[PDB]
Amino acid sequence: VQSFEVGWVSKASANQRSGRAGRTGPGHCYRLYSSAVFEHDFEQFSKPEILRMPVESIVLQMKSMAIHNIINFPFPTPPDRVALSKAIQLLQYLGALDNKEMITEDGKKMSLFPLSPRFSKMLLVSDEKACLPYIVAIVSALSVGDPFINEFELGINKKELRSKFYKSRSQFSKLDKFSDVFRLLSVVSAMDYVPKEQKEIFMKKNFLRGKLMEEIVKLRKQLMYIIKSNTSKENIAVVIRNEDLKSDIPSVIQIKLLKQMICAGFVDHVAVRADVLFPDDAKITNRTSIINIPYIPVLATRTPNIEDCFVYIHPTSILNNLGEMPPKYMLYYSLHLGGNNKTRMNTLCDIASTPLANIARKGLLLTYSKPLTGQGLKTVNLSPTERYCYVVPRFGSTVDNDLKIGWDLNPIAVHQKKQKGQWTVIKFI
């Protein structure tokens, strides 16, 4: 994610700032930082702002600029062509960009949001069923990082501290049992109810960094100010309320609504069990730990060897230490390439099949097949252009194109109306 931070200026910019002290008459330039610090911690010519903004944000701004193509654009400094193309398909997968590269109605909004397009998608959909106080809390935690300390890092594994760590890790996930971002949501929210005087003790009990939460607490107020700005027409009138920051526990329906919030911003970083997509291709059983159980993203390229595609879950994730068979579709913030034997996945939450198609209907990843003919599978044709029927959707890559590797979603009822010779998805019935 991109953030605005206080940082040391360049040498030349500092030298210019010295100049105007002397421009009127010979002047004395004073620097709070020392000369020896000046040589080391300052860069000699401030690095271009085009490099500072995310490449995806360059495209989204450019798509706010309705530019026909990023390569037709004339530019002083190059980002590589392919990444500029990866950004376009990236934004398209999020629903921000159309198949014709034109910036969608929501596509325009994420451009307005100063935040990253992936995180900006969270901002748009965050305000659903009073779940706004969370998606800021998750987003604040995601950007700042993980306040948690791993068991291996501490060195507790002494055995009594291991139990308290286990109890501490258990009480995180009483909110969500299969999800690792929502357990964290319970913690960042829990310390809010916690008194300030007793905070350090809970923060020792749960092995939480003193300084990282205060930024999160300071970060959530800023991000709520931004969402309350953008969402309402009164983008300056809205003021940050600590009671708005205050949140009430979710319902099980809200959790499911929250799960699809997690998938909206990271729709590309979603993986199914490798055994589910290829049953019996790779030997898997309950004895094999969740480290051993493989996964494969829909967007990932198919490889000559299946194990190359295979990705695996982290041990620190609760879903590993539950001891139960994990859900079919799992979703991660980032792929951690560490570990030649197995590639480590940090997964946020478990997304179900049809709700995954819900993030797919906003996005362009979904591919819908033709209506089927069978017992009780007839199609309603109210008018010549609209029809109701069941269609099997294929997420990401289709069956015909074998370059990628994707998974097929179960058929579910849908309304289809013809536009331009193809029937768009009006709403899943």
Binding site: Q171, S186, S189, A190, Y193, V194, I249
Partner: peptide, 4 residues
């Protein structure tokens, strides 16, 4: 608290 409820989260705790």
């Amino acid at each position: 608290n409820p989260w705790l």
